[PDB]
Ligand binder design. Sequence first.
Ligand SMILES: CNc1cc(F)cc2c(NCCCN)c(C(=O)Nc3ccc(C(=O)O)cc3)c(=O)[nH]c12
Length: 196
Amino acid sequence: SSSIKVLKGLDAVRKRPGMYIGDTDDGTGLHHMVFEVVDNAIDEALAGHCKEIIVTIHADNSVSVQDDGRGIPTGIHPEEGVSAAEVIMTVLHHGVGVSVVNALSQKLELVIQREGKIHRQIYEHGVPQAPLAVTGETEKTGTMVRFWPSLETFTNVTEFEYEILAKRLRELSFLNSGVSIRLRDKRDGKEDHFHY
Ligand SMILES: CNc1cc(F)cc2c(NCCCN)c(C(=O)Nc3ccc(C(=O)O)cc3)c(=O)[nH]c12
């Protein structure tokens, strides 16, 4: 039931993205993709587990958001029969849910560090290539989401603008005293640190 429901939700978002992420021509939807993923990292900070968020603009026009929180739970739900992480990445929940970013990404990479293991999963248009898998051991904890926005969905403004991410991250750091945000642009080495 869940599998059918999930695919219906992905289809819904790709068919009417304006209802979920906003305008797909003028860059507002595109930048909103980053801000949704960051809002999830900020929740993990607000719960008191994440101290540092790192937002990176990569040279291939993907964006990663790294937190140093607990790591999304990885245990297979008895019910849905896939990792708790995969449910969070794929089930449809301002505040539109990461499954919307995933639906509208050509590719999404999830890396979770939790209970001494690295877990990794790759998505394409919100669909998992394979179940979440352990790739190594680690002493660290946290969640990293890197996504490549679908050029089927986004036109015209397709490249992230440093200033637009900077303004919003600075604003989120003002609203959430104590959270520390790094923004780094791999295209030219620019970086900023936002903290109130
Ligand atoms: C870049 N970071 C990042 C991106 C992202 F797209 C999603 C998340 C995310 N879940 C999203 C749903 C909620 N707002 C969590 C989360 O669920 N953490 C979390 C939840 C429960 C437990 C536990 O019960 O043990 C431990 C950790 C997180 O930490 N970081 C995220």
